[PDB]
Each structure stands twice: as structure tokens, then as C-alpha cells.
């Protein structure tokens, strides 16, 4: 027996507070990515990079914010956008009720071990079966073109696509994702945390909020909550293979302006 009582209304307020904060922190929402990807927007159409000639034109006509290998220039671009995503996700984290009242070293640990899992979550919002929106929607790079880059770069995006295909089938919206990303950030099992109970307490409240959100928003998926928790298990391991691959590249191949200052 679900009920509209003060407890539920507080979970809906928490859900709305997180959604609003999500909208401020991440200008390219899933609703907007979906409008661009499905050509259901009046907005300027993205430039498609589907081969080497289309990439060369792309560097010219997609403006972002040298190295003679195409594959390295692409990977570096991904690494710079990842840095930017860490800033926006930290900004988002600050808006989660209880997060800035935690020991700063724990705040750093939560974000240190979480941002990769959130990047792969939010990347899914920008992907379909054909590829991924780049430069906040000015560009679209195809899955197969990324795959065609010489080793070890050809496989850097594949596991994100594998994850995204199955994650996007759950049809989550920005309201669902905002709560989901907050559950990830407040994970009490990160290594090196001083004070666990206060983190689990916020996560408990976030879990209740997420559960209510998915029940209200997804009438034809009675165990979507259990499905989303299963995806946090996936994500941890995807991040394991990502981290392990970034080792190889850094020590087998020859730095963002914020990382200099």
C-alpha cells in the first residue's frame, strides 16, 4: 500500500531538488541529447565523423575548448572532456543534502572513486547504436570509426557502448538519473573513508528517493530499482577495465590547462 504522506512528499522534494541541481550542473541533459540524436530539435544539426576524411573536416568545423596521430588527438579530447565532467560532478555533489557537512577528505574520496562511474552513466545519455555526441552536441562520432583507431585506442570506447546499449534500454529520464548519480557518489564502501555511517545514512535517504521515483515514473518495470542497483555492480568493473587500460596507454604512449595551473 503506497501512500501520499509527509514522508513520500519529502522524497519527491529531494528528487526535485536533485533534478534542478542536475539541470544547472549538466547543460546537455538526456532529453536534449535525445532531441539531437532523434532529429526532433530546431537546434543546429551535429557534424557526423564516420571516417578519416569526415574526421579531418571535423577538426576544422567542430570547435572544441598538437599531435600528428588522429587516434591520439581523439583520446586527448576525451581526456580533456573527462576533466570538465569532474568539475560539473563535484559541483552537483555539493548540492546533495548532507554532502558538504561530511569530512572534506571523505568528500574527496567519494568523488575520486565515483566520477568514472558517473561519466560512463552520463555518456550513455549521449550515445545510440551509431555513436556518441561530442563537443556538447556540435559533433557525432560513430562507434565503428572509434573502433577503427589503431590499438590500443580502438577499444577505449567499446565497453562504454556495451554498457550504454543495455543501460539506455531501461529508458531512464533526467529525473531518474539525478537520483541514481547521487546514490553512486554516496557509496560507503569506497576505500579510505574515515566516517562511513554518515555516508550510508545519506545513501539510505537517496535509495528511498530513487525507489519512489522509479515506482512513480516506470509503471511497466516493477523491479527497475533492483535493475539499477545491478548496473552499479557492472559500472565498478567497467571502471576497473578503463583504469587498467589508462595504465597501458600512459606507459606505452608518449595535459589539460587546469592540470598545469
Amino acid at each position: 500500500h503506497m501512500q501520499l504522506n509527509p514522508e513520500s512528499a519529502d522524497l519527491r522534494a529531494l528528487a526535485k531538488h536533485l533534478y534542478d541541481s542536475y539541470i544547472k550542473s549538466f547543460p546537455l541533459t538526456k532529453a536534449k541529447a535525445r532531441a539531437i540524436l532523434t532529429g526532433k530539435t530546431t537546434d543546429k544539426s551535429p557534424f557526423v565523423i564516420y571516417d578519416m576524411n569526415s574526421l579531418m573536416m571535423g577538426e576544422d568545423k567542430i570547435k572544441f575548448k598538437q599531435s600528428k596521430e588522429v587516434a591520439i588527438r581523439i583520446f586527448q579530447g576525451a581526456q580533456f572532456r573527462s576533466v570538465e565532467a569532474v568539475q560539473e560532478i563535484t559541483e552537483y555533489a555539493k548540492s546533495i543534502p548532507g554532502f558538504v557537512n561530511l569530512d572534506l577528505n571523505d568528500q574527496v574520496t567519494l568523488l575520486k572513486y565515483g566520477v568514472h562511474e558517473i561519466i560512463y552513466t552520463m555518456l550513455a545519455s549521449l550515445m545510440n547504436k551509431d555513436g556518441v555526441l561530442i563537443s556538447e552536441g556540435q559533433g557525432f562520432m560513430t562507434r565503428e570509426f572509434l573502433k577503427s583507431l589503431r590499438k590500443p585506442f580502438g577499444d577505449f570506447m567499446e565497453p562504454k557502448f556495451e554498457f550504454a546499449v543495455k543501460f539506455n534500454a531501461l529508458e531512464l529520464d533526467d529525473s531518474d538519473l539525478a537520483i541514481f548519480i547521487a546514490v553512486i557518489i554516496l557509496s560507503g564502501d569506497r576505500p579510505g573513508l574515515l566516517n562511513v555511517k554518515p555516508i550510508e545514512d545519506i545513501q539510505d535517504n537517496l535509495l528511498q528517493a530513487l525507489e519512489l521515483q522509479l515506482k512513480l515514473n516506470h509503471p511497466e518495470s516493477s523491479q527497475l530499482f533492483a535493475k539499477l542497483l545491478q548496473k552499479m555492480t557492472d559500472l565498478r568493473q567497467i571502471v576497473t577495465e578503463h583504469v587498467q587500460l589508462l595504465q597501458v596507454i600512459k606507459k606505452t604512449e608518449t595535459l589539460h590547462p587546469l592540470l598545469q595551473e
Partner: peptide, 11 residues
């Protein structure tokens, strides 16, 4: 490195 950006962004 990651910590650098997180620490600055949190302030």
C-alpha cells in the same frame, strides 16, 4: 591529479 581538480572545485 584528479584530487587536485576535486579539491579546487569543492572550495
Amino acid at each position: 591529479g584528479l584530487e587536485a581538480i576535486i579539491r579546487k572545485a569543492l572550495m
